[PDB]
Amino acid sequence: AQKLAEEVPMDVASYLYTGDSHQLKRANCSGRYELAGLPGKWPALASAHPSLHRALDTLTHATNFLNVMLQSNKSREQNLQDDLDWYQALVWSLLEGEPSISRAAITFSTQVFLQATREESRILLQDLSSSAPHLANATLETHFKWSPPYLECENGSYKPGWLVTLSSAIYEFRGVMKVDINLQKVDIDQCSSDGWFSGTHKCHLNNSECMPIKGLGFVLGAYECICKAGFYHYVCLPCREGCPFCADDSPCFVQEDKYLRLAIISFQALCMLLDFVSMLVVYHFRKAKSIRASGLILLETILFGSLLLYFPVVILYFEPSTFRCILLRWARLLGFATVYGTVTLKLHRVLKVFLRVMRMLAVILLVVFWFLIGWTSSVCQNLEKQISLIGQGKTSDHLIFNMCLIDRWDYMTAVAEFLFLLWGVYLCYAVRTVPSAFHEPRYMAVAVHNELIISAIFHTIRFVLASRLQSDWMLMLYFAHTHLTVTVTIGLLLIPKFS
Amino acid sequence: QKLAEEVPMDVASYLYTGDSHQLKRANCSGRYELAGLPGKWPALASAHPSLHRALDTLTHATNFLNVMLQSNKSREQNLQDDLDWYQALVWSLLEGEPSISRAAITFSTQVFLQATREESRILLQDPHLANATLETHFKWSPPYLECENGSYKPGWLVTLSSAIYEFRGVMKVDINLQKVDIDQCSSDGWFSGTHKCHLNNSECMPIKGLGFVLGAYECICKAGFYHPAYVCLPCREGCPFCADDSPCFVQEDKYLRLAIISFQALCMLLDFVSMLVVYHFRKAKSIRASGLILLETILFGSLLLYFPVVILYFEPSTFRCILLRWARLLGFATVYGTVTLKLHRVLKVFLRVMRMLAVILLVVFWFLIGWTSSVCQNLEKQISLIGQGKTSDHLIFNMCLIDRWDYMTAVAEFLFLLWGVYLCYAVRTVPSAFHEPRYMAVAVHNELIISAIFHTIRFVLASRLQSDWMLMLYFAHTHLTVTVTIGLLLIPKFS
Numbered sequence A: 001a002q003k004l005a006e007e008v009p010m011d012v013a014s015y016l017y018t019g020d021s022h023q024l025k026r027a028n029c030s031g032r033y034e035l036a037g038l039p040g041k042w043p044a045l046a047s048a049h050p051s052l053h054r055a056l057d058t059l060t061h062a063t064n065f066l067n068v069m070l071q072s073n074k075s076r077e078q079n080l081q082d083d084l085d086w087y088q089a090l091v092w093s094l095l096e097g098e099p100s101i102s103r104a105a106i107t108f109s110t111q112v113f114l115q116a117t118r119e120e121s122r123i124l125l126q127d128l129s130s131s132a133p134h135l136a137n138a139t140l141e142t143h144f145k146w147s148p149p150y151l152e153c154e155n156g157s158y159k160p161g162w163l164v165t166l167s168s169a170i171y172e173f174r175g176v177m178k179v180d181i182n183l184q185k186v187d188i189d190q191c192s193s194d195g196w197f198s199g200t201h202k203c204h205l206n207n208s209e210c211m212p213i214k215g216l217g218f219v220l221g222a223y224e225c226i227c228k229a230g231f232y233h234y235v236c237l238p239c240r241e242g243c244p245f246c247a248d249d250s251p252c253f254v255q256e257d258k259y260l261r262l263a264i265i266s267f268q269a270l271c272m273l274l275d276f277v278s279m280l281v282v283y284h285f286r287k288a289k290s291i292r293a294s295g296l297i298l299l300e301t302i303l304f305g306s307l308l309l310y311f312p313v314v315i316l317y318f319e320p321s322t323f324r325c326i327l328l329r330w331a332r333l334l335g336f337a338t339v340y341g342t343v344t345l346k347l348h349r350v351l352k353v354f355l356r357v358m359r360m361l362a363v364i365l366l367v368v369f370w371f372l373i374g375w376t377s378s379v380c381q382n383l384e385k386q387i388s389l390i391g392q393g394k395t396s397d398h399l400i401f402n403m404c405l406i407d408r409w410d411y412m413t414a415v416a417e418f419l420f421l422l423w424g425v426y427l428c429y430a431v432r433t434v435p436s437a438f439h440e441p442r443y444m445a446v447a448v449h450n451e452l453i454i455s456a457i458f459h460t461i462r463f464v465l466a467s468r469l470q471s472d473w474m475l476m477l478y479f480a481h482t483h484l485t486v487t488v489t490i491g492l493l494l495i496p497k498f499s
Numbered sequence B: 001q002k003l004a005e006e007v008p009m010d011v012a013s014y015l016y017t018g019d020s021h022q023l024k025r026a027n028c029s030g031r032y033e034l035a036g037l038p039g040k041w042p043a044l045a046s047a048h049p050s051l052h053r054a055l056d057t058l059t060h061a062t063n064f065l066n067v068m069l070q071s072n073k074s075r076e077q078n079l080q081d082d083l084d085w086y087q088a089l090v091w092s093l094l095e096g097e098p099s100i101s102r103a104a105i106t107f108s109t110q111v112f113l114q115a116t117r118e119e120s121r122i123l124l125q126d127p128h129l130a131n132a133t134l135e136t137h138f139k140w141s142p143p144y145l146e147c148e149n150g151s152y153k154p155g156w157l158v159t160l161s162s163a164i165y166e167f168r169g170v171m172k173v174d175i176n177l178q179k180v181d182i183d184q185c186s187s188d189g190w191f192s193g194t195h196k197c198h199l200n201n202s203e204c205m206p207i208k209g210l211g212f213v214l215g216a217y218e219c220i221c222k223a224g225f226y227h228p229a230y231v232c233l234p235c236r237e238g239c240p241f242c243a244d245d246s247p248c249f250v251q252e253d254k255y256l257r258l259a260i261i262s263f264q265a266l267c268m269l270l271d272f273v274s275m276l277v278v279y280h281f282r283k284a285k286s287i288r289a290s291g292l293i294l295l296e297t298i299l300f301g302s303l304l305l306y307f308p309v310v311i312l313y314f315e316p317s318t319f320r321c322i323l324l325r326w327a328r329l330l331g332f333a334t335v336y337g338t339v340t341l342k343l344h345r346v347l348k349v350f351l352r353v354m355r356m357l358a359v360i361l362l363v364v365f366w367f368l369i370g371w372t373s374s375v376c377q378n379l380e381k382q383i384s385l386i387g388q389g390k391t392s393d394h395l396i397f398n399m400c401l402i403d404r405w406d407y408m409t410a411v412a413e414f415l416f417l418l419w420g421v422y423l424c425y426a427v428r429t430v431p432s433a434f435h436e437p438r439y440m441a442v443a444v445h446n447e448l449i450i451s452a453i454f455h456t457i458r459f460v461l462a463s464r465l466q467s468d469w470m471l472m473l474y475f476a477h478t479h480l481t482v483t484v485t486i487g488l489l490l491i492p493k494f495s
Helices: A013-019 A050-070 A083-096 A135-141 A258-284 A289-293 A296-307 A311-317 A324-354 A359-382 A408-430 A440-464 A473-497 B049-068 B082-091 B128-135 B254-280 B292-305 B307-311 B318-350 B358-377 B404-426 B436-460 B469-493
Strands: A101-108 A113-118 A123-126 A150-153 A158-170 A175-182 A210-212 A223-225 A392-395 A400-403 B100-107 B111-117 B122-125 B156-161 B170-176 B224-226 B232-234 B387-391 B396-400
Touching (some): A050 A083, A083 A113, A083 A175, A083 B049, A135 A158, A135 A175, A258 A296, A258 A311, A258 A473, A296 A324, A311 A324, A324 A440, A324 A473, A359 B404, A408 B358, A440 A473, B049 B100, B049 B156, B128 B170, B254 B307, B254 B469, B292 B469, B307 B469, B318 B396, B318 B404, B318 B436, B404 B436, B436 B469
Antiparallel strands (some): A101 A113, A101 A175, A113 A123, A392 A400, B100 B111, B100 B170, B156 B170
């Protein structure tokens, strides 16, 4: 909030405050004290580096000692002979204790003053008021008195150190003691809650975090903004998708040949439309030798089942959800039933006549619905929200991909399909020479064996290696599998009834 | 360790250093002062800032005297007017901090001055430390109790000592270390040991109040409870919060459980000898209606159907619940299937069944295999277990759990018996040699009603059923249903 004000009230110091480099500041011509009154905070009585605290502690003891000596009975005011020696020793003592105090001075008038500075390694002293002198300010107040940040000027040359005046009254006021703490080698944290001008004006919220350096100098721009799960290119930005550790801002999710996806879905919808078209057609041709050999209801049922079996191809095109996988199972399972049950049930009707199918079908769908209702409940109730989840993102050893998962339930269902087809294989093997005007049983058995073999292969391939199948190979596998099986099973039962 | 050595070198102070009650100490007459020589450490720690403040005020006053007396033109007409300066010097040495009791400086440049915060007015007036200073920077001391024409004075003092320049001076502050809390269970603090609290099963937990006093800690025993000196106890079998050290694994009568198992095994043996008898009477006029293979099939199903009453008598495990499911399901099938199918044969003749039975057995084995696999493969090790713990009022009990699979199973049994019901209602006017359909239908209706009631009561409130009530319920259900179903088909074939 003051970053703009700080960038419009400095010329030589401006660079020095942001870089620590004395080489510009030493060439800048000075005219008076170059301190800052407003850019800083309220005060440094709480949040301050240890040095400052010690600096104040020194003055405190030196102020209490003088106060008690000035408030003692029969105050002599014999400042001529040896009082000046006491005060000079009291000032050299004031300096000698803290390792971060650069000048110190004492002055009073009731007309002399002494000061000292840490010159090279020893204390230089002089008989002249030198350093801090808030006497004019203390008199105007007439306790403690701090000051702002300020650069000292020596022989018309901006000093290369940031000083602070501390001032305290001597007791009515009649003295001003002042230490000039050298605040040049102090730490400052713009990311701290309550401290020296806590302004972290470089990284606010978006993938932001301030982890600053410990030992740098009384200088700013020393706080490495951290990219909280994002890209690091002294700037933080967002990442392509749900893929953290963006060592590059490149993508993690595999690509999709959409050109190959739209053809897939379009051909599937074409086949579904043609199936519905076939159902209407058979509803038109109800007086031919269709009805006599194979009832209309059974054929419309087969076609509705096949329509109910194309669903997986379109379910897999969309993004994997947890409502989808379930519908994938319902469709597959229920259509298999309503299609091959009546297929083999029709064969059963034949073998029985050689020596009433809907009642003997609804048993199948009842068992099916019972199993489905159970599976769905066990998933939705316990293993969808509590611990387990179907939708799983697996890695291809360098890239990820989502998919529906499999479970033992699928293994046993495939086995059921196998055995249910086994009954039809033996049934078809039995009726190998039964009188027929249209030879339907021949085509039925072909469909049955096709489904059995093709389904075994597909299920094996699906359950072996589902950890390394991206979302464009499974689509092709489900498409080539369903097209072969179902389209053959439809043609073999429909085609011959028009010729 | 030095806890035993600290409890063998005290008389009155020992109790005054653990309670902090001046009322005993003030009655104990003492010649001179005494201090705890053994302070299990030295005076160079950062436990309280007070000591830091009183070292700061001492080092700041010692830095002045050492830089004044040793400065240039130090002529030192020491008796004329310097005394005024030194008096202001010592008076201000204790008029800066809040906890410093006496302060004094001695010099030969003998001369000495002192000042003490008496009540609220700091009076200003005109040994070991000075002697050790002559013998020998900063020089601290240990914890020590003062006393003079008093008793052992009721205050813990510390001597701070320094020198000037050689050794021509001795300034001392007596920091009042009486209002300084101590952590007996700190990693680094004064008296940092363990009076009588073993961490094997417990944790200290210090407080923030009182004053310097040993035994200022309330120990906490984890995985157990304390005596209601405070020390720890190993808790009861598998019960982590023992408000009492009483047991949680609820009382279970044995002279009921034994009778139950006895009666069940008696019925099994009676069922087995019911099988052998049938195998003796392979020749009769009764079996022509109800074949031999059908009855032995019913009796073997019944025999295994009894299993649930004996499984629950044992401690429940993961292998147990699974066999409970298998047995119940498998036996229901192999009995009521052939029952219902005999009625079907009757109705069809009115206008073998082993081949029309293995279908059901196949469907059952298929579901069982799947259920067992999904259980043992996923939800037995990952996050999920069969062992479930419920509570009756405020007390626990172990048992097997249920899952939606059981509800759907019950529905299947219902529907299978509704087929039997219709099949029984269709055949209500046939002639017969033994009126078997009459008793069969009686068994079916009974099975349906009792089966519905039991499964409902079983699912509704299984979280509040201690492990002696479920056994009684299984006893009642299985005895009623199965024993009726056996009698109604067997009994009439001997009369």
